[PDB]
Structures are given as C-alpha cells and as structure tokens.
Symmetry: D2
Subunit: 256 residues, 4 copies
Amino acid sequence: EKFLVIAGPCAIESEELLLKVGEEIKRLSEKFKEVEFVFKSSFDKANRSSIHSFRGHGLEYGVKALRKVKEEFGLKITTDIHESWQAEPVAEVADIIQIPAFLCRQTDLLLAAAKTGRAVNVKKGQFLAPWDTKNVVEKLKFGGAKEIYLTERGTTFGYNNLVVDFRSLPIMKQWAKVIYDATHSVQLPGGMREFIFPLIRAAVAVGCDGVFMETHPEPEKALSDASTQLPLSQLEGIIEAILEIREVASKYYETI
Amino acid sequence: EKFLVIAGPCAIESEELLLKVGEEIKRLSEKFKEVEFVFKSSFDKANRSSIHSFRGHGLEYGVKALRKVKEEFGLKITTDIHESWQAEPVAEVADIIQIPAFLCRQTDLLLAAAKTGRAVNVKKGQFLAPWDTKNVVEKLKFGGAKEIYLTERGTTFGYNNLVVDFRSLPIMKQWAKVIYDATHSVQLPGGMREFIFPLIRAAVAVGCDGVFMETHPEPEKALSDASTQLPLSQLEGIIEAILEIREVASKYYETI
Amino acid sequence: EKFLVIAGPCAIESEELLLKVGEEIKRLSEKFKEVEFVFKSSFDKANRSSIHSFRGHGLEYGVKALRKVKEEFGLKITTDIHESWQAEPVAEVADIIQIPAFLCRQTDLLLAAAKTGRAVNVKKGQFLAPWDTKNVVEKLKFGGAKEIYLTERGTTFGYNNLVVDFRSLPIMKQWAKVIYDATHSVQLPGGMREFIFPLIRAAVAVGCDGVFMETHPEPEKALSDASTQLPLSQLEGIIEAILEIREVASKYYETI
Amino acid sequence: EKFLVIAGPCAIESEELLLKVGEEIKRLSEKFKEVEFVFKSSFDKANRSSIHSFRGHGLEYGVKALRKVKEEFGLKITTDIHESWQAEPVAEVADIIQIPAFLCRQTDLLLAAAKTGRAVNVKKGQFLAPWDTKNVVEKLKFGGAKEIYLTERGTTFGYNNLVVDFRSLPIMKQWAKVIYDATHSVQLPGGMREFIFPLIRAAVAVGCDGVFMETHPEPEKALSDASTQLPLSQLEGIIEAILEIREVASKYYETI
C-alpha cells in the first residue's frame, strides 16, 4: 500500500513559509512516487501552554494559505480543528481533518469532522491506552467517516516527559490505519531532536501506514515547536531512510 | 473564605434527580454553616468513551434544571462547558464555570469562561504536571478572571489508571485555590469506590480549599460514573469526617 | 493498637551520631508512651548510585554501635540486610530485620530473615504494585516470620521521580501491618524535604500502623540522604502532629 | 566486534533441555558466522513472585550443565548471579556474568562479578533511568571490568506493565555496549509474545550491539517465563530478519 508522509511547518507563520516548504515537499513527491504526501500546517495553536505564545493568523487566513499550497503544488492538505464549527470551513480545503490529542475524546468534534466526508486523523491522547482507540474509531464510523487514521504521538510518562510504547502500532492497526508522529513524540511537555531519527526508524521497523513530521526551513526561528521541528534540508534523507527500512522490514510485518 | 464542598449527581439525568439531591445538599448546607456548598451536575458528558453512552438532555434543559435548583434551594451552581459558545448561556445560572480536564489547555474555552465574570474551576488535566498549572491560571487572569480554582483529579499512571500525587496540592496553592476531586481521582480510565473516603481524608490532612464529590441516590442506576458516585446517604458522614480532620490538621498547613 | 515510629540516622556515620539521636528518641519514647519506638540505622548503604559515595564502617562496627544504643537507652533496633549471610549476625541485635526495596523479591534474603525468629519489615520495591506484596508476605510466613511489616516508600513515576499511591495502604493492610516511609518517598532517584510533612499527614489520615522517618542532627552534613533526612529538632513536633491527626481520623479507618 | 545474540532457555530445567537448545544454537552459530552467539540459562530463579514457583536445581548442577554445553558445542556461556559469593564459581564456566535487573545497584555483586575478570552484562533495573546507568558502568570499571554490557529490558510503566523507551539505546551507548532483551521487555510483572518480534525489529532499526532472547522447545511447558519464551523453531527466522534489518539500518546509526 502507498505509504503516507504528512509533513509541513507546525504553524502557519505566513503564507510565504508555507510556499517555501510546499515547494520542497512537491519536489520530494516527484522523487518518492511510492509515497503519498500530505502538507500539514495548523491555522491555530489553540492549546499553547502560555497565553503569550504564538497562536496564528486566524482560520480565514490559514485556509487561504493552505488553498494556495494545494493550488500551486497540487498537494493534499491537512490541518487540525479545535471546535465543531471549524469542520465545515476547514473541510473546503483539507483532504484530511486532524483531531488534536487533547481533544480525541470530544464527541462533537469527531462527529463534526466525520460528516464532512473528508478523511480524519486523530492524534492519540497522551492519556489514552492503545486499546482505548477502538471507541474513537467507532465514533468516527458512526459519524460517517470512511477513511480513518490514528496517530501515535507519545504517552504521559511521569511529569514533563512522553514515552513511545511501540506496542501501540500493531494494537491500533486492528481498527485503523496507523501514523507515527516523529516530532511530537520526543517533545517534553511544559534531549529531544536527537531522538527524532532513531524513533522514526523504530516506527517503520515495527510497521505503520505513514509518518507525520513537522519541518521548518530554520527550526530555531519557528514560532512553535522550535525544539522539535526538523530542518527542511534534512527531510529528503530521513524519508529515503524510512522507505529503505520499511522495505527490508515489510516482509515481517504481522497480519492483523 | 470557608471550606468549599462541590457536590451533586455526575450528569443531569433529569431535573427531578437534581431536586432530590439538591434537597439533601440544602439540608447539609443548613447543618454545616461553616461550609460553602456548591451544587454540581453536567448538562452534557461530551467526552464519553463510547458513542452509545449517555450524554444528557441538552444545554437548554440542563440550564433550566440548574435554575430550578438555585431558585428552589438558594444554592450556588457549577457546571462544565465544552466549547466557547457555551460560556455565556451557562453563566446565566452557574456561579462557577467548570473547565474539563481534557480541555484545561484550550485557550479560547478558558478565555470564554473568564469573560463571563464568573468564578472558574479548571480540572487539572491527567497529562499536566502540578507546576504546569501556573500558565493555566495566567490565561484566566489575562481573561479577566478573579476567582480561580484548580482541581486535583488524578494523573495518568500507566494505562487505565490514575494516581493522586498529593504533592500537587501545596504546589498549585501557590497560584490558586485548590479543590480535591474525590470521585474522579479513583476512576480507572477506559476497586474504586473503596478508595474515595481514604483519599479524601488524605486531601484534608494535606490541606486544600475544598472538595468535589459526585453523589447520587442510587449510584448503581446512574447513567454516568456509576462505579464512583457516592451514595447520597453517605454524604453527611463524610463531610462531618473531613471537617473534623481539617479542624485538627489545619494547625499544620504550610504557609503558601 | 500501639503506633510504631521507626526513626534514626540513615547511615551509621559513627557510634557517636547514633547515641546523640538515640538520646532524643529515648526522651520522646518517655513522652509518647502510646508509641513504640524502634531505632533505625544502616550499617551499610549497599546500593548507592555512585562507587564514590559513603557506604559505612562495616557490619561488625554497625552491630556493635546498635547494640550500644539498645544497651544505653533500652530502645528496640532495626537495620537492613543485603545478603543472606547477614541475617544471623544482625539478628543478634535487631528486633526488626529490614529488607531493602530493591531486594523485596530476593527469596533467599527473605527466608534468611524469617528463620531468625525476628520481626521482618520489607520496603515495597519501587517496581512493585500494592497487590504484588501478598506473595512477599506469603514467602515470609512460609519462612517462619510471625511479625511482618510492609513499608510504602514510593513507586517509580517517570524518570528520577517517585509518587506515593496512598491506595497502597489499605490494600497492603489486607495481609500485613503497614508502615509509611516519610523520607524515602519524597527522594528523587538518581523539591523534596518540603513534602515530607504533608505526605506523612496524608498517611496517618488514610491510616497506617506506623511511620518510618530518617532523622539527623544536621542533615546538610549527612553522608547519605542529606536532602531528605529530617532535622532531629523537628522530630518531636512531627510525631505530635501525626498522633493528633491519627486520633481524629481513627474512627473512620475502614475494617479490612 | 560482531553482533551479539544471547539466547537459551530461561531456567536450567535440566541439562538435557540445555543440550537440545544448545544444538540448535550451535547450528545457527554455524549458519551465521558474522554473529557471536552466547548460550544463556539461569541456574536459579532467585526472584520469583511466588514461593511455590520453580527456582532450579542449584548452582552446582547448573554450572555442570553449562559446562556440558560449552564442551559439547564450543559455545560461549552466560548466566546470572544473585549474591557475591556466586561470582567466582560461576566464572569458571561463564564467559559473561549477568547481573539481575533488581540487583543492578548492589555494589558488592557488581564488584564481585568484575573481580572474576569475566565480561559483565547488567540488566537495567525497571526503576532506573537510561542516564543512571553511567554510574553502574563506573562501578564495574572501578572493579576491574573491561568488557561491559547494559541490557534494555523495559521500565516500570504504571502497575504490572513495562514499556520500552527506545531512547535508552543511544543514551546507554555513550558508556557501554548495548543489548536489547526481547523477551522480558514484553512481560507483564506480577498479550505479550505477539510483541516480541515487532520490538526486536525496532531495536535493530534504532541500533544496538546485540539482542537477548529466551527460547524453549515448548514454551507452554517451560517452568519459567512460559508466556514469553520464544519457540526454538522460530529462532532462525527472527535472527535472519534482524540481520537483514540491521544491514540496511546500520547506515543511519548515529555516532556514539
């Protein structure tokens, strides 16, 4: 099956930033034809820890910038919603509607996304056990979702730390396609970037249906997740690496 | 102020149920004049695990039932909101607006609640560290809130289990009044009731500004948190118990 | 039943140190006649993190110093063993043989202690679940132990941190007398002392059969656990406090 | 050096069993010349949960059986010690002395093992953080050890569960060769086998110096770790699989 690579800048800092990253993702989509790329970027960081941190330039501006990426590069789009009313307007551009990790249990948000007819990708809450996602998928199917993804992005492990329990990949695969979030899994809520590559190698070795990676031309200047966003120049190499490891490991992937 | 006791049935199964519980809380209110009682009940269980579980009768029916309790018994009210638009209509009756644990980082919800001018009680997310709540308080203050509470309700401890780290009480006290949720702290996400009383005794021994307890005439028949809701008949005894323990222990509560 | 207070300097830094602390413990035993005091001090810190840290002056010297405390003050004694061969010589002076937390599953060590005829107190391993202690007690009974204690000293919670799950007290009480370790529970393996008092208040409010507290005339100069040992001058006040909280809470202690 | 594969039956149920497994490991040894095989089996399960569980036939019978394996198949040997006095007699046959996870902080055991001049493999305690292993290595070096291994076997994650934090592999590599224990990492202290292969694939994808795997002709009849021991017949396939994954992934292993 075609491997999914969801990548892009964490937040829509500007339409310019989006086009710069989109240009590269487009180039890679022409090279890695066996991969289905989906451009990701949040129009709003609605859950920052601090009231003083960057949130975004609004829904309107964001959807407009994303529409530009899709129009200029012909790339599929995904962005996250935070309240039910956002599903409809976002669905006009987003091929995949993303559900934030803290909101993976909010029934109305999941239902709002499901009825748009668009694909839905739910970030597994840091408080959720792998088997607890069966009901999340059930809600989505109940709401009309026909293409569902579950994203592994780490689990609460003590204070200000997350651990990736890779047993979650084969467990969640029982009821949905599985995506591994390579950048949020190494973040320290409220010794990070150095683990992005090794853990993503682990993910494809275990087996998943895609990977999610935030990338920015200059991470140190990013207005969000400056500590975990992958330098854009490193994207091509990481992708080639995971495709290689996926290929050699693939014959051993267990059947669900 | 005086010790706060937030109690009531988990969900508004019917205003009839609210009246029955309100009557008992009213009585206790007259018996323990040194305690400030606040009647609690959710008009919607917006985060149930299963799509087939009870959610409620809607915001309108709920606010109406809560109005009936306040008018008929002169009791302060508190209920939780799940999306920003709900803050205003709920504030019409709620003296304290409650913010769900999973939603404690949603900036707009916090701001929406703070804008109503009402007091705000934020349930500490199971993924949050005690010190990470300082930023939560700051968002509310920025939003104009002046009466702010933080509620301890357990922290993710492995899968399908929560642990109460009592160190959180003195830590959170540095920036807000602290409430201990005696019923949700012992629930196993996705042997419970036997630990409610023991842990509530610990909470007052350590020191807090109030306690939160869901109570129902017949917990076994409750449509929500049936396994953890306290039988109404046992409420008086537990309240008297914590007041006695508090009276003695308060002598040793650390400053700030 | 007579409450147990196990206290003393973490390590036997010198026989002099022991006599100084013993003198105070003796004074308190004359005042708090409802408490059974047991003087504690390790002849060897066999599990320090660093090879460069203080361990002790040997078994011989330690047993001799402890015998002096018992002889001069008439106080019961307890110390921990690390290998089976130490049970016999230690049993000559120790009224209670202590089993280290990391060694709570070593069958031969538990058996060696049990056959001495002395009481045995097992520190619950940081890796052990409360219900997992039933088998620990079974081994001891199998080995002839007639007086058994289980000590709560925290559970692994993320890296370099421990949490006290107070549900462990009533659970372990099902098969043994329960002791709460007030000083090791707040240590950060490999923001500490300020939590000793509040957590011990929680322990007696929930209900336990005794408390364990390391105390040193000048903690900052201690050769071990300098961050958690309680200043000797503060011991009397803490003990009075827990006896008061125990008394008022006692009528609510659940029957096992 | 070459990739290390430590394999064998959990416990020495009989030297007969050891010979049968040794024969298969010998064969694979001749098939994969690029791999250094080490036969493992414990002469005593000194930390079983229950007093009524299988421990073994003693140190003498065990060392004799292990001798038979080395003599008959020319295979290197490894077994674990539980008390200091055992290091010397065990070193007579063991090329690698194994230190139990619960005992990774017992200074005398580590020193005793290091004194034999043999290589030492320390199982990382379920309570230890990856960086806390630096001090473990230092103890062994101080004791004269020169060939040191650290084995990843899971970390305490809530009650009766272990999680493998793969970030530990690159961290521990800073001061010792790293081995991944594929069978104990999925055991539930106090759905297991299905995760052995997936996680071992992750381990080599991330990068380690070897893998540890308990194997038995008929796991269902094993007297120890029956639920996690790999059927002997499946050993060849898994080894070939990890060698192929390692071959491809090694290109991306980070330096130090």
